[PDB]
Every structure is written in structure tokens, then in C-alpha cells.
Amino acid sequence: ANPCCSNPCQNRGECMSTGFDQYKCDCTRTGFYGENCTTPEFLTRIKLLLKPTPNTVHYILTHFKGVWNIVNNIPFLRSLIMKYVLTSRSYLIDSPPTYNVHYGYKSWEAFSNLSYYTRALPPVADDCPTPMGVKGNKELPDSKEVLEKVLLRREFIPDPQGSNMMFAFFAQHFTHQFFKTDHKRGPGFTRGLGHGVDLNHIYGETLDRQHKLRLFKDGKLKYQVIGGEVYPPTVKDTQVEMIYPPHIPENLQFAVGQEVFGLVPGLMMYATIWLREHNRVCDILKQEHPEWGDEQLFQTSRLILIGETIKIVIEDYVQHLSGYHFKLKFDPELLFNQQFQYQNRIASEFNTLYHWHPLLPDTFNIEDQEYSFKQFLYNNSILLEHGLTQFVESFTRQIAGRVAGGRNVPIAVQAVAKASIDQSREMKYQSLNEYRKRFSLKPYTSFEELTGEKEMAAELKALYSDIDVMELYPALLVEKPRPDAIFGETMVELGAPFSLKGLMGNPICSPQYWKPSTFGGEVGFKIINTASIQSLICNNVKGCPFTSFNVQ
Amino acid sequence: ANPCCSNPCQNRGECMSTGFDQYKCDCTRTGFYGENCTTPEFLTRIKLLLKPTPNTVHYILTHFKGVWNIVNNIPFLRSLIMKYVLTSRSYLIDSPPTYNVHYGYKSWEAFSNLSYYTRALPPVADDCPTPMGVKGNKELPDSKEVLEKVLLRREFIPDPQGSNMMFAFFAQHFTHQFFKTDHKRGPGFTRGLGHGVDLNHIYGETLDRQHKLRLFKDGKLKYQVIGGEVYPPTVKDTQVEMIYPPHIPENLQFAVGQEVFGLVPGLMMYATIWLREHNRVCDILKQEHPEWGDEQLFQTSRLILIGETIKIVIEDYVQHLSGYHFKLKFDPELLFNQQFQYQNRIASEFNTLYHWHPLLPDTFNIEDQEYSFKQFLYNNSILLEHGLTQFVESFTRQIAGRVAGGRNVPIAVQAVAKASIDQSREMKYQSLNEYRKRFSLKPYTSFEELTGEKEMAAELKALYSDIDVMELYPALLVEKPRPDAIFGETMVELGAPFSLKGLMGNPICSPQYWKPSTFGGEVGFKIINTASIQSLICNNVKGCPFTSFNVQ
Ligand SMILES: *[C@@H]1O[C@H](CO)[C@@H](O[C@@H]2O[C@H](CO)[C@@H](O)[C@H](O)[C@H]2NC(C)=O)[C@H](O)[C@H]1NC(C)=O
Ligand SMILES: *[C@@H]1O[C@H](CO)[C@@H](O[C@@H]2O[C@H](CO)[C@@H](O)[C@H](O)[C@H]2NC(C)=O)[C@H](O)[C@H]1NC(C)=O
Ligand SMILES: CCCCCCCCO[C@@H]1O[C@H](CO)[C@@H](O)[C@H](O)[C@H]1O
Ligand SMILES: CCCCCCCCO[C@@H]1O[C@H](CO)[C@@H](O)[C@H](O)[C@H]1O
Ligand SMILES: *[C@@H]1O[C@H](CO)[C@@H](O)[C@H](O)[C@H]1NC(C)=O
Ligand SMILES: *[C@@H]1O[C@H](CO)[C@@H](O)[C@H](O)[C@H]1NC(C)=O
Ligand SMILES: *[C@@H]1O[C@H](CO)[C@@H](O)[C@H](O)[C@H]1NC(C)=O
Ligand SMILES: *[C@@H]1O[C@H](CO)[C@@H](O)[C@H](O)[C@H]1NC(C)=O
């Protein structure tokens, strides 16, 4: 019965029920008047008649390599750009946070509760007629279908971008701090109240945990040496909470910031690395400050590491993920005169877009061997067996599956991807065209447009009928990739903002934090400013096995 | 042994232990180089040689009344000013938050833990030699002395500013949401994680509580009618948690957002008002949206009310408290192009400066009667007896005690004010000259300067010896008032920033919030934009008894 059901209000306008069967649009600071926030104002026009399509830009970003090389070696220029990129996004996210699962209108309970996941777009009134408000049928295509009909991988599709296993597990490992949905509660609730890059996966969310993972000496994290190698410590020695299957031997039950991380030798590997990184830093500090305390070292480290991370992600991970020729730079000093809200709340959407299963290979080739999901899972014995070094090298090449192309979802991952759809539905997610419009994206006029190819498209049009009624998550994996890219435009234009927020919006990136002091001074500062997934592995891993998020 | 103990680094510089008996200053974005962040840069100079003393300004603010009347009527002008005032402060606070009780260096644990109270200035290394770092003796003057020697009120001193009881109880009541120190934990910890104006005192901090205080109908708060009047409801009917003394009869045990508020008929009175305000709003909304739900009304109300509050404080309370001739305006639209961090963490300092006991009268004259603390305390029977209307009128006149003059602390309040000193000491608070310097205030060179008068001064100099070693809290109450003002410069220049933060930095003051929609549209929006302690009482209280925070 909700007169807003139809998502009438345009351009970030706000719909309000001005009576049982009537509504109203809050076209405030939107740039458009009219009952629907459509009629634009002048500057609006000129603003749009100077707004280049993302594809256009993306293009320019990935071409003229020669020129990009020029700028890539001209500090002010580079920054001037990187900044532009920074700022280009910025004005997109709703910070401070607004809606969430249960709240379609701004509410204190909303803005306050931290267990919720904020929503870039409001849900749909449970009173609304159709799942997408009004357009569509009493229901949505069964997921199993869609799942199969266009998602599940038939022939493994490699990511044209060269995304190796390293990248995959990173992204996997990394994103696992922010995204941490508490299911006991629901799909919409997170358990990572840190709502951002806080390496809680390395040090636990609660202090209690953190302390058990702490050695309380030189601010180092409790560790353990197996076969002359540094590894996370046992659950039987730290009593830390770790999610493991009955058979696992105590000598194998690893304890780390994240309780789930034991079920994936891929994850565990990274852990071990970072863990090693931390303590590595501790030593460097204890060198600088022979007069510091355990609790100070431990805390300075965590600050420096968080820095590195934010760096290695933006400058490596994200860099590669974009395939731009411009070298992405991480320097907060760029927002020091930019109206930027150094804060962040994690959105449901951003979580879903994450469901990057396609990356997942069909087997896991470590050195000679090749493993199956059925094999890999919870078999850290694997990790122990081959060693970090090999793992690195190995994973540094085993290309990962493309993700936007279509039907490239491992069958083992079956269950998951389905949920990914089922969920968004429960959370009354909005139409993909809505989320498209939201981020100022022209909506897809035909399934064929969304895919390019006519196969799936037609196959989908069968299922959804109205392009509008197309679900986001799905549309994302099926989306029509960019020229050899791994993602479509949609997935990029959504995570780009969402990301550079929690990335930049992190405390340490704020003025009264960005300084040597904050990190034990210059030395420990440099560390962050000179951090690459490369060195991260170089230092922490034996023999400095070369690596990249790119398979050569 | 801490080489930083001596607070060497100047101008917000950061000190770091560069070895056992050596340190270093992080003069970053400070404006000064030199080992101590002293040598200034050019623009710095020109910036200072254009920086008018607060006293100067304060003066200009409280004079030329004729001119102020001119501007007070030319919108752009007024705003242009108010804004200036807004922005003048801003660049002072450390948002996002930095140090706290246990942390003198920036730390995650710090920035993360919300039970802590942030600290505008770092504590002092427990390893430091003297309580104020180095200057001073192995200890500090016994508090009992100071307490008596210069704090306790002998002859009641009225605030020259006319601060009636209304103001007092408001300030009291209002500030009681942010400040809510959890003693079970310690002096440094707050229980109001809301860390700001969130009217948790009206709706409780936890949802559980809130729901019990909710009637779940038209989004109204559960209430009760006694003798034809609207009053908060009983603990025996809501099971809400309320702090009460054994004798109190259930029929008197009031349940309200704040558990402590029952022990002060002054507080309770305000509650009842606000409570009445809320439900009042609910009706106005239910009029606008006959199609809204209990939980939406309830939430919109709380949003509108929070607005009112932020208004009534800034525009009334704060206005009066300043005695400026310029009419202070509350309009977030002023920061919509200002690098302002719409967020807030409550500082310990700000909490202490609050300890405004001097305001407290010696008796409480309600109509004919006159009461004693021993009387008033936990005697809401009083409130019930006379009625809200009288209470208003009465309190609207009973002048409150000045606070900066000196020795004006009620003896009943004895215990408290002492604590106020004892505490800051535990929390290793810094020197008053430090906190002075901090907010770019020339430090007091002599106790006589801090007081003007020679009596107390001399009396103190006996106790502290070095002006520097003068404690803040004390120095505040004894401080030398402004020409007929109720506060000295120190207290003003500290709470000014601290305040306009949590005041402005509140969500609802942010761009994606400041709009009719957010509040059920224009109608419910206007409400906030047209709110005065006056109307607040006018609407909620019978007969619209005139009021002001000024006793005529
Ligand atoms: C605002 O948007 C609504 C739709 O969200 C428009 O209303 C529809 O207009 C068509 C064409 O006249 C009618 O056939 C429909 O019955 C209307 N309602 C709906 C729910 O579709 C409306 O015309 C728009 N107004 C403006 C000024 O843009
Ligand atoms: C920086 O500040 C320190 C004090 O915080 C200064 O050091 C003192 O200087 C005096 C005068 O030479 C000596 O008598 C003291 O022994 C020094 N130490 C202390 C703890 O007082 C120092 O001179 C300042 N340096 C600069 C460049 O400003
Ligand atoms: C001076 C440099 C001018 C660069 C103009 C670039 C215009 C790019 O144009 C883009 O090309 C894409 C193909 O890759 C299409 O998919 C997009 O729809 C189209 O807008
Ligand atoms: C064009 C307007 C010029 C105004 C000049 C104002 C100078 C105020 O000067 C101030 O006066 C106070 C007395 O009230 C003193 O206590 C302060 O120390 C003094 O700086
Ligand atoms: C957040 O909301 C959920 C459901 O509304 C509730 O169960 C939970 O206790 C809330 N969290 C907090 C911290 O209030
Ligand atoms: C686990 O790994 C070890 C060593 O690689 C191997 O011997 C064992 O068969 C594996 N078990 C499973 C269930 O994968
Ligand atoms: C905050 O810190 C105190 C002491 O460091 C600790 O007891 C408390 O549990 C912490 N709060 C949280 C939420 O971790
Ligand atoms: C409480 O108030 C009632 C009514 O004003 C009065 O009769 C009674 O004496 C008071 N008791 C105390 C302890 O103040």
C-alpha cells in the first residue's frame, strides 16, 4: 500500500508518504525539482553536460599508456590525479550512515545500532506489492534456476586480468574483517563493529581475544615454531575461539584474529604472514624505542600494520583490480583540504558485491599437487606440508576465474552463491537498475545490454521479463565485462566509492593521526609508506619469493 | 623517567621518547619547527598577528549592542557571523578522537573503545616524577584544603548573569546524557556510548530499556496521569531500571530515560516536560501521516526532539551563557562547505568543567516554600505536590549561584566538588596552564592573574607555589570572572569548542539528514527550527508559564 513502493523519487531524492495513497519527494541539494526530483537546475545541466561516462573514463584510464607513464613520474601530476579520483567518488556514499535492513527512513536506532549493516539504498516496504516494489511479479525467478541458468561455471573462465590465487585469497582474507555477518542475528547484521580496516582478523574483535593472541612481550603476538617456521599458535595454548571441525588435531587447531580462518589454508597462510609482519614490526620498533612497553609496541605495531594494509590494498590489490595505467597512490594528505568524513559504516550492498566466487579455481595447485575444495577445506595440514614459500610461489601463478563474464561459479560454491541471491531478497534489496541509477549509472535497457551476448540475456529475459526487475547480485556476475576486465561497470562503480571510504575514512588517514609520531616516528612511518604485497611477502616469507596479484 | 614528562613539545606538537632519556617533537601541520615546535613559519606569524585575544572578542561580542542589533536582523550577516563563530572554534578539537585515560599515545584500542572518555590532553606517565610531570612537589595540595581554602561557598554569590534555577536544572538535566561516568569501571569511562546529544536520558541507552519506556501506539512514550496531569510512568509498570532509595513508594518511583533522574525533582520536572514534548510531537506527526506506524512515529519524534534540543541549547542556553549581544543561530547549513567532521567523542575535561556546583542555591524555593538539599533530594513528592507550572515559574526566578567568582560551592555539595578534584588527579589530568596553552590561551603567570583578587590567590600560592602546578578544575571555579559574567575565560574557551562539536557533529546536522523528510517533512521540520525553551515549556506546561534561563 506504500505510495513510495514505486521508488518514484529520482536523483537521490527522498520519498515520503504524505498520506495513505500519496507521497512526496525531498529533492534537497539534489539538483532537481519537480514532483519526482527530475526537472534539473541550471548548474545541474552544465554539471551533467561535462560529466563523462564511467566507461569513457575507464577507457582513458586504461589507455594512452605512454601519457600515463609521463604523469606516473610527476608527483604533483600523479597526486593531482589520484586526488581527482579520490574526490570524484567521495560525494557518493551516505556518511554519516543512513538506512539499514529494518529502516527505510532515517532513524536514530538506525544511525546508532552498530550491529546492523548500513544500506546504500533503502529496503522495500514489506507492505509493497511486488518484490521490487511494483514492477515484476508476485515473486522473483527461483534462484536455483538463475543460479544454474547463468551462474554456475561450466568451463572454467580465467580472469583475463591475470588475477592469481594470491589476489583471490587476499581479497578473501582482507575483506573478511569488515564483512563478518552475524547469522545468529541475520543477514543484515555485521559482527565487525570496527566497520572498517581495523585488522580485527589479526587481533580479534574483543580485547579478551586480543589479549590471548598477545604474548605481552615486545608487544608481540603469541606465535609458534614448527619445523623451524613461524606459525600462528594453538587454540589449546591460548584458549582463543576458533571455528574448526571435530577431527582436527589440537597441534593443528590454529588461533588467529579471525575464528573462521582455519578452514582455508589459503587464509591461514596470509594470517601467518601478517602475524609474522606484526612481530617483525615490533622488533623494528623495539630497536627505535628500547624504552617502550609491551602494550605500546603492540599498539604502535597494529597502527603501522593497519597503515601497510590500507596501502597494499589501495596501491596493489585495487590498483591491479582496475588495470588502469595510472599508478594509484595512497596519500591521505590529499584530503587535507577536502570535505571528507573520516568515518565509515559498512553497507550490505558492498558485502554482496563481494561474493566473488568466480575467482575460485576448480582445484588448488600447490607445487606439484592439485587439490579439490573437498580436499583443501580445513586442511591446514596442507599448508604445513608444503610451506609458506611454496604456497606463495604456487598461488602467485594459479590464475583465478573471471567474475563478470557469466556462468563461472564453482559448483562446490553452489550453495553460497544461491544464498547470496536468496539473502538480498530477504533484505528486500532493490532493483539492479535502482542501484545503478543510485550511483549515477544509466540503467540497463535490455538484458542483452547488461551482458552483450544474447545467450544468457535471452535466457534471463525468460526469467525476469522486465530488465528493471533484474536483481543486482546476479546481474553483477553475469554483467558484461569491460574489454578484458574482470568486472563489469556496475560492480566497479559501486565498490569504488564504498571502498575508498572505509579505506580513506579510516582514523589513521585523518590529519591528527597522519604523522611519524603516531607510528613511533619516521622509521615505523616509512614502513607504511613503503609497503607492497611484494615486500609484505618478501620480509615475512623465506627467500623473498617474488609475487604479485598478477600471474606474470 | 619519561623524557616527555616535562610536556616539552609546544603548539599541539607531539612528544615521542626517542630513547630512555631523550625525546622528540612532531611539529606537523603545527606551524612551528624547532626541537620544541616553537620557531614559527611565516603564515603562522601573520596568522597570529591577526589573532585577537578571546577577551577582546568576548568584549566586542558583549558590547556595541546597537550594532549587534543591526546584524541580528540581516540574515546573511547574522549567519556570516554565527558561521565565523562556528568555524573559529572547529579547528580546535581532536576529531576523530585521540587519547584517553590509559593512553597517552594514539592507539587503536584508544580510538576504538567507546566506554572511554576521550582526553583533549594526554594523561601523565605514571612513571613521571611529579603529578604535573616535573614541575611541583612529590604531591599536590590536599583537596580538603583547596576545597575549603577557596571553593566552598560562604556567602551565596548570585550569578551576575541572572542564571535562574531553570537554566541550572536544564544544564544539569541536559548534560546528563553525555556525561554518565560509569564508576564501576572508573572515572574515565562513560556509559553513554551515544557520546552526544541523543536524548538517551529520555529513551534509555539500550533498546530493551527504550521499549519499556515505549507505549507502542502512535510512537508514544508510556506515560501516566496523576491528578489530571501527565507524568512519567512507574517502575512497577515498566520494570524499567531506576535508581531510588528504599523508602520511596512505588506510586512515586518514576521511570524515565535516565535511571538517576528520580533523585532530583528538578530533573524529574524537565523529564516530564520533554516526555510530554515527545508524545506532543507524536500527535502532530500522526496528523501529518495518518498512515504511519508506531515505530516510525516514535522514531521520527525522537529525531525532531533531538533537533529541538540541539536548537534550544545553542540558541537559548548557550546564548544566555555567553551574554553576547549577537543572537546565536543554530543552522547546520553553515557547515555545508566547511571541513567539519560530523561525529563526536566526549572528553573527560569537558566533563569536569561541567562540575558547575556553584549554580546550586542554598535552598529551593518553590512558590511559598523553601527547601534544603536534605529536603529536595529524592522527594518527587514535592514535584507532585506543587505541580509543573509552579515549579516552572518558581525556578524561573530563583537565581543560581555564580560559578567562576570563587569559594561559592554549596557545603552539601562538599563531597562532590572534592571528588571533582581527587578524580582529575587520578586521571593524571594535566596542568591548567597546559590545558590553557592547549586551547591557545596565554598561561596564567600568577595566581593573582587567575583570580584578579589577592586574597584567594595568595591563599593558593601558599598551596601550589608554582602557578603552573595549578590544577584546572579548581582554577576554573576560582578563575577570575568576566565583567559580570558567570564564567572566566578558561571555562568558556574550553567548553566552547568541546560543545559546538557534539552539538553540531551530531548526525542530524549532517547534509544527508538536514531535510523535512528526515522529520516527517516541513511541519515536523519547522518544529525544530522554531523551538525555544520557552515554547518547550509553553506547549508542554499548563497555562504557558513564561520562562527564560534568565531571572528577568
Ligand atoms: C512522477 O512519477 C510518477 C511515477 O512514479 C508518474 O505517475 C504515473 O504517470 C503515468 C502517466 O501519466 C500514469 O499512467 C500512472 O498512473 C502514474 N502513476 C504511476 C504509479 O505510474 C508521474 O506522472 C510523475 N510526475 C512527474 C511530474 O514527473
Ligand atoms: C626545548 O625545551 C627544553 C625544555 O622543555 C629546553 O631544555 C632546557 O633548557 C634549559 C636552558 O638551556 C636547561 O637549563 C635545561 O636543563 C633544559 N632541559 C630541561 C628539561 O629543562 C630546550 O633548551 C628547548 N630547546 C629549544 C630549541 O627550544
Ligand atoms: C582525447 C581522448 C578522447 C577519448 C575518448 C574515449 C571515448 C570512449 O568511449 C567509450 O568506448 C567504450 C569502448 O571501450 C564504449 O563501451 C563506451 O560506451 C564509450 O562511451
Ligand atoms: C573597532 C572595535 C574595536 C574594539 C576594541 C575592543 C578592545 C577590548 O579589549 C579588551 O577589553 C577587556 C575589558 O572588557 C579587557 O579585559 C581585555 O583584556 C582587553 O583585551
Ligand atoms: C540492534 O538492533 C537489534 C534488532 O533491532 C537488537 O536485537 C540489538 O540488540 C541492537 N543492538 C544494540 C547494540 O542495541
Ligand atoms: C589433508 O592433507 C594431508 C596432507 O596434504 C593429506 O595427507 C590428507 O589426505 C588431506 N585430507 C583431506 C581430507 O583432504
Ligand atoms: C575498554 O577498555 C577496558 C579497559 O581497557 C576493558 O575492560 C573494556 O572491556 C573495553 N571495552 C571494550 C568494548 O572492549
Ligand atoms: C518530602 O516531601 C513531602 C511533601 O512535600 C514532605 O511532606 C516530606 O516531609 C518530605 N520529606 C523529606 C525527607 O524531605
UniProtKB/Swiss-Prot annotation, chains A, B:
Cysteine pairs bridged by disulfides in the record: 4-15, 5-128, 9-25, 27-37, 538-544
Known glycosylation sites: 36, 113, 379
Consequence of substituting residue 500 to A/F/P/T: Slightly reduced activity
UniProt topology in membrane: Peripheral membrane protein
Localization, UniProt: Microsome membrane; Endoplasmic reticulum membrane; Nucleus inner membrane; Nucleus outer membrane
Induction remarks: By cytokines and mitogens.
Main location class: membrane
Names of required cofactors: heme b
Site keyed Aspirin-acetylated serine: positions: 499
Gene3D superfamilies hit by this protein: Haem peroxidase domain superfamily, animal type, Laminin
All residue ranges annotated as the EGF-like domain in the record: 1-38
Top-level taxon in the UniProt lineage: Eukaryota
Cofactor note: Binds 1 heme b (iron(II)-protoporphyrin IX) group per subunit.
Annotated PANTHER family: PROSTAGLANDIN G/H SYNTHASE (PTHR11903), PROSTAGLANDIN G_H SYNTHASE 2 (PTHR11903:SF8)
Quaternary structure and partners: Homodimer.
Biological role stated in the UniProt entry: Dual cyclooxygenase and peroxidase in the biosynthesis pathway of prostanoids, a class of C20 oxylipins mainly derived from arachidonate, with a particular role in the inflammatory response. The cyclooxygenase activity oxygenates arachidonate (AA, C20:4(n-6)) to the hydroperoxy endoperoxide prostaglandin G2 (PGG2), and the peroxidase activity reduces PGG2 to the hydroxy endoperoxide PGH2, the precursor of all 2-series prostaglandins and thromboxanes.
Protein name: Prostaglandin G/H synthase 2
